[PDB]
Paper text:
Strikingly, even an octyl chain (DS06 (5)) protruding into DDB1 supported the formation of an analogous complex, albeit with a lower affinity (EC50 = 1,162 ± 115 nM). We then probed the interactions between the DDB1 Arg928 and the solvent-exposed arene moiety of the ligand and noted that compounds featuring aliphatic chains or rings as their gluing moieties did not support high-affinity complex formation. Some compounds instead contact Arg928 via hydrogen bonding (for example, HQ461 and Z11) and hydrophobic interactions (for example, DS06). In summary, exploration of CR8 SAR around the R1 position demonstrated that surprisingly diverse gluing moieties (arenes and heteroarenes of varying size, but also aliphatic groups—albeit weakly) can engage the Arg928 side chain and therefore facilitate DDB1–CDK12 interactions.
Here, to investigate how chemically dissimilar small molecules trigger cyclin K degradation, we evaluated 91 candidate degraders in structural, biophysical and cellular studies and reveal all compounds acquire glue activity via simultaneous CDK12 binding and engagement of DDB1 interfacial residues, in particular Arg928.
Author numbering:
A (entry chain B): 715 to 1041
B (entry chain A): 1 to 393, 708 to 1140
C (entry chain C): 20 to 267
Amino acid sequence: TESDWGKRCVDKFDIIGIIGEGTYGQVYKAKDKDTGELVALKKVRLDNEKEGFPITAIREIKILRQLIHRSVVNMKEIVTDKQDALDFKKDKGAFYLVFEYMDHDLMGLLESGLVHFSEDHIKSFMKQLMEGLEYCHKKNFLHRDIKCSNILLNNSGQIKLADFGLARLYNSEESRPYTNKVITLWYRPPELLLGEERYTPAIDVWSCGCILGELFTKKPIFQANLELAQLELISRLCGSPCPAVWPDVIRLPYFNTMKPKKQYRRRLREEFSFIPSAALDLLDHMLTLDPSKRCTAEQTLQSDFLKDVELSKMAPPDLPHWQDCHE
Amino acid sequence: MSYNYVVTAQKPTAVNGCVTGHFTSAEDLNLLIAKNTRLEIYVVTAEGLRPVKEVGMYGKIAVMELFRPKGESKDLLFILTAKYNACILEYKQSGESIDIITRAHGNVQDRIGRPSETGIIGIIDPECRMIGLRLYDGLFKVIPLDRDNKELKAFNIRLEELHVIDVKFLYGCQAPTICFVYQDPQGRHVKTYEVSLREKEFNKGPWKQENVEAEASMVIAVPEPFGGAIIIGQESITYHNGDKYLAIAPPIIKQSTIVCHNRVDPNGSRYLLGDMEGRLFMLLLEKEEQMDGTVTLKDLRVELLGETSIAECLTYLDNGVVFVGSRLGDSQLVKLNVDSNEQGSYVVAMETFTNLGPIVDMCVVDLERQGQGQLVTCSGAFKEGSLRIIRNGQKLHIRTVPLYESPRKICYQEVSQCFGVLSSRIEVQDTSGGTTALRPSASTQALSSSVSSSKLFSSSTAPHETSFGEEVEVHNLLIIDQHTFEVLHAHQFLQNEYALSLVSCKLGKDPNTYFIVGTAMVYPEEAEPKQGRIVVFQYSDGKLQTVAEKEVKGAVYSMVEFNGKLLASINSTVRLYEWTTEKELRTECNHYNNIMALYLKTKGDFILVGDLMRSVLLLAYKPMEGNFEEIARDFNPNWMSAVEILDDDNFLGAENAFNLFVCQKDSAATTDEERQHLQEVGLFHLGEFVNVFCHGSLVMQNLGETSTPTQGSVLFGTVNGMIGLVTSLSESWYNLLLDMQNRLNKVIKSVGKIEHSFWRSFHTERKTEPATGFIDGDLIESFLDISRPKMQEVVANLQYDDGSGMKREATADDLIKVVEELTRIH
Amino acid sequence: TKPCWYWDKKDLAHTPSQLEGLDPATEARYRREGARFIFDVGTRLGLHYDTLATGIIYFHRFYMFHSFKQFPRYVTGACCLFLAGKVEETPKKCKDIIKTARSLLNDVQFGQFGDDPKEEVMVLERILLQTIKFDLQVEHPYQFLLKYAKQLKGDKNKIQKLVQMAWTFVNDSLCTTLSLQWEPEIIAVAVMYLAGRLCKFEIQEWTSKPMYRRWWEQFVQDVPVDVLEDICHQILDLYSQGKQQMPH
Ligand SMILES: CCCCCCCCNc1nc(N[C@H](CC)CO)nc2c1ncn2C(C)C
C-alpha cells in the first residue's frame, strides 16, 4: 500500500541534479519514472553511524507525517538504495525523504535578481506563511529555524515552509529545558540572544517579522555576525531590553552581561515610515521585545493587513524572466 | 586558495554625466566629465577643450554637481558614490603642482531603506543652503551646507509620496523649495514642498499640485525672471508657476523619448533637449513684459536643430559649442549655427571623442599573422552601433566600423577571411501593415542578402496584433570581410525571431566550416520564449546557404563547439548534439537542472554553465556512457552576466552587482558532499558590468614574451566601454603584491578620503564582504607614480617569501622593476 | 496514507514466531520479558514513561513481522528503546544502553548481543525503521487516562485512587499484546472501567452526564462493553497467574 514506507527503491526516480547541501545529506531534484512528477530527495546517510539515523531527520519524519496544510511542505514517501541482498548488517545504503519539488527558495529569489514585491504580493506571501505557522502552533510544534532559505515558493505563488529539522513540541503546562542557540543569528529573537532556554512559540513570530521587514527593503533587518552585535542592532531599532518594557528580562541569564551601548528608544515606526500603515502595525507587534507581549500567529491573521486578504487570488511575485536576460 | 590579478587595459569611456562651472579658478570656464569612477577636468577655449587634470575615485560617480558657497572664490565639487560615499572637493594649484582637496567627507548610507526605482538623485539649493538626496523610497535626506559640517552629517524627512520620478530645487523662491513629479495609482502629479533646516521637516509648498502626463520624466528648474518649473514627457512639455499653466504638444517629440536637458541662456529663455534617436531640439521661452515691469512666460516653442549622438548628458559651453556626452556612442563637440546648412541642419560636428560604448561581445583574432592579436568588439547601440578593431601600439590604436544598428554577437571564421556578426535594427509599424526602418544600416546595405524562409513556426494558431507606430527588432546575420570590413552578406531572420548565439566551427566528420546561429521566437505575451531554432549556414562564394535547421522548445541563449559536437543551452536545458553524415543535428544527451542556462564555456570534456540566479555549475561529458555528469555547483546564489574558465580547477564569474568572483573544486576529496561544492575562493568588486570574457592578449607575445610572473590571460568587456584583464599568480607573488597593497593604501591619498578596502569590498544590496583572492593591479601600477619619499616609505620593512632567498628585504628600486614588468602584460 | 497497526486476537496464532514452531505461551513469555527488559533498562536510565512505552510498542509490532528465533529479543528491545529515545526527544547514547543492559542481564542473556553489543544493535536500526514503516508517532493510554480523568469531578481522593490504579494497569498492559489489538483510547477507558469495578466506584456520577450509565461513550464512541471486558480479562489474567495481586 501507499503507507509501506522505506521499501520502494530510489530506482523509481530519475535524478536530475543536486539542489542543495542539507544538514544530514545532499538534497536532489528528481523525476518520478512512473508519474513524471518532479520531487526533491533529502538523502539520509547513516553510514557514519556515530549515533545511527540522525535525529534531525527523525524530527522531520515524525512531524511532517502529522502536519497537513497548504503552506507546509509535504513528505511524500521514504525510499532506499538497493539494499544488500540477504544481508541486514553489510547494508550501508541510505534512505531518501521524498518531498514535492518547489521551484525556488526565498533566499535565492532575493539574494540574486531583483524580484519585485508589491504590497499585494507581500500580503499573499505573509498570509500563507503565518497561516501555516498557526496550523503548526495550534498543533503545539515550534519550527525554531525560520530563515529566508527555508521558505519555499512555487511560481504559482504558493508558499510552503520546509526545514523542520530543529522542530520540537511545546508544552505550556510543563516548562521544559531547551537548546538555547536555535534560530540563525540574523533571524534570532532577543530572548534567545539572552539565553531564555525555555522559549515560547513567539520565537517563530519574531523571525517572520524580520522577514516582513526584509520584504519591504529587499535587505535583512538585523545583519550581525556575533550574538552581541545583533542585540545592538535590534536595540537601535526596537529599544533596549529593560524591565520598563519586558518585566521578566531580569530573569534571563545574560541580561546584565549583554548590555547595549545605550538604553535606546524605539524607532521602529520612524526608520520604517515608508511602509504601509497596516503593515507597520504588524511589524511593530511582531518585533515586540517581550515574548509575552509579542502577538501570536492567529492575531497576525486577524490584522488589518492580512484579515481581508483573499487567499484564492494567489497574486504571484513578479518574476522578470526574458527581459532580465539582457539589460 | 586561488590567487589572481586584475588590471585595466582601457579606462571607462562612456560619459555618465557632465557639468560646467568655475571649478579650477573663479575665472576659467570648466567642463567636468564623469566616466565611471573617472573624473576629467577640462578648460573651455575658443577651439575646444584644454585638459588640465584627471583623477580616479574609489567609487562609481553617481552625483556630480558644482556649487559655490557664499564666501568662496570659486565653485566647489560635490560627488556621491554608488556605495553612498559623499565628499566635497576643491581644486588647488601651486605653480606646476595640481592637487584635489577633500574638504568634507562621509558615508550617507541608512541602516534601513528601500532603494528607489529612479535611482540616486542629487540636487543643491540655488542659495547653497543644503544638499538634497533621494536615496530611498519615502525618504528625503538633507545635508546642510554649513561650515562646520566637515563630516557631512544629515537627517531624513518623512516623505509621503513614495514613488518619486524626479526632483529639483526651484529657483526664485522665498524659502528652499523642491519640485517633484511623483507616481501613485491615480497617475503622475507635480507637487511642491518647502524644506526647513530649523524644523527639519517639510512645510506646505508654494504652489498648487496638478496631475501631469502619465510618462512625465524630467524636472527643469527655470531661473528668474520666470521661476517655476518645466515638466518634460513623451508627448507634452508643460510649465507650471503658481496659477500659471502652459502646455505645448508638438508631434515631433512623440516620435522619440526625450532623455536629457540643459540650460543655454542663464535667464532661462532657451534650453536644449535630446531624445533617444539622437535628435537635438531647442526649447524656447517666449517672454512678455507687463506694465508692472514684470516678466511673464508667454508661450513655449520647440525647434529641431539637427542630429547628435544619442546623448546621456548635454552641456552648453560657450558661443555655439555644445558638449554631447554619450553613454551608447561617441561623445562630441558640435557647433550650433544660426543659419542652417543646405540640408536644413543647424548642427555641425567639431570633434569626436572615442567611446567603446556597450561591449555586447568581442573576440580576439590575429588578422595580420603577427602573433600580437587584435581585439574586435561589438560596441555601441542603435545608430551608434559599430565594430572596433583594437591593437597595442604607448597608446591603443582603434579602427571604427560604423553599423548604424545594434551588434549582438561576433565570431571569426578564418576559412572565409571574414567575421560573422549578429545585429538587430529598429523598424516601426507603418501604414502598409509591414514596417519601415528609421534609417539604412549594415543589414540593409549588404552586397548580397537573404531571408529565412523556414516553415517550422508557420503553424501559428494564435496571431499577434500590431499597432501603427510600435517598434520591432529585426535580427540579421552579417558576413563582414576581415580586411575591408565590407558587409558582404546580410541574412534576415524570421519575423519576431531574435538571434542570441553564434559560433563558427566544423562538426563531426564534416569538413565544411559553418556559421551556426541560435534563435528564440519572442512574442510580447511570453514571459519566457517557448520556440527557437538552431540554424546551420554555410558562407560560400559570396552567398550564405541554409544547410539545416533544428527546432527547439525555447531560446538558444548560448552555444559552443565541443570536440566536434554542438553544445547548446535551451532555457533550463543544456544539450549536446551530434552532426550526422546526413548533415542534420541529432541529440545525444541533456542536462535539465537549471533555471536559465544563460552562459556556456568548455575546456576538454568539462563544461561551465552560467545560470540566471544559481551562480555557476561544473558539468562533465562522460564519453564512456554518452551523457552528462554534475561535478560541482556554487550553491551561493548570484545573478550572472558572464563566465569564464581559468584552469581545470578555477572558474571566473561576473555578477550583475558589478562584482567578480572565482570558484574552485574543493580538492578535499573525502565525501561526495565536499567534492560537489565549488567554494568561492575569490571575491572582488570591479565596478563595471562585464558582458563578455575572452581568452587572449593584445601584447606582442610571439617570442617577445621574455617572462612575466603572471600566468594566463583573460580579457573582458563592460557596458561603460572599460576593457580589463585577469591573470593568475603564484601564492608567493600574491602575498608580495597583497602586502604591498596594504602599504600603498596607507601612503596614497584617496579623493574623497574613500577607503580603498571599502571600495573593492564585494557589494550587493544584501551583502558586503571584504575582497579576497584578487590584486588590484591598478593600485599596484600606481606605485610607479608616487613621489620618491612615498616609495621608500612603502618598502620599509618589506620582506619576500618562498624565493631563492627565503627572507629578502625590498628597496624602492626593486619594486619599480617588478611593477614595470607587470605593466607589460597590457 | 497511514498504516494499520491493529490485528485480531485470532490473528496472533500466525505470527512468524508461531509458524517457526514457537508455541503461544512461549511467545507471550518472550514478549513479557522483552517488554520488561525495555521497561527496566529505560527506567534505570531515567527515561520518561512515554519513551519506555514507545520502545515497547515498536517491539510488540516488530514481532508481528519477524520470528523470535531469528532476532534475539533483548537486542531488539534495546534497539527499540534507542530509537524510541530519539523519537520522543529523550535521547541516549547506544553505549549507555548496552552498559545498563549488561548490568541487568546475566551472562547467558547478554550472549544474545554477540561479540560486539553496540554493533548488533546499531545495525538493527535499519530493519526496525523499515518494519515500523517509519510510523514513528505513537499515542499511549497515559494521555487519555489524564485527559478523561480531568473531566471527572467529585471526591478528589477517590478519583486519584482510580487514576493510580488505572495507571498501574496501563504499565502492566505493555507486557501484553493489547497494544496490538485496541487503540490506546480504548485502553485508557478499559483501565478506568477495571479500576472502578475493583474500587466499587460508580464513575458516571463524576461525569457531566451522571445518569448516563455507559459513562465512557462520551469519551470513546462505539465501544461495546465486550471489548472493555475482554481487555479487563487479559490484564487480570497476568495478575492471577503470577503471585502478584491487584494493587488496590
Ligand atoms: C539548480 C540549483 C537550485 C535549484 C533549486 C532551487 C531550490 C529548490 N527548491 C527546494 N529547496 C529546498 N532547500 C534546500 C535545502 C533545504 C536548499 O534550497 N528544499 C526543497 C526544495 N524543494 C523541495 N524541497 C524539500 C527537500 C524541502
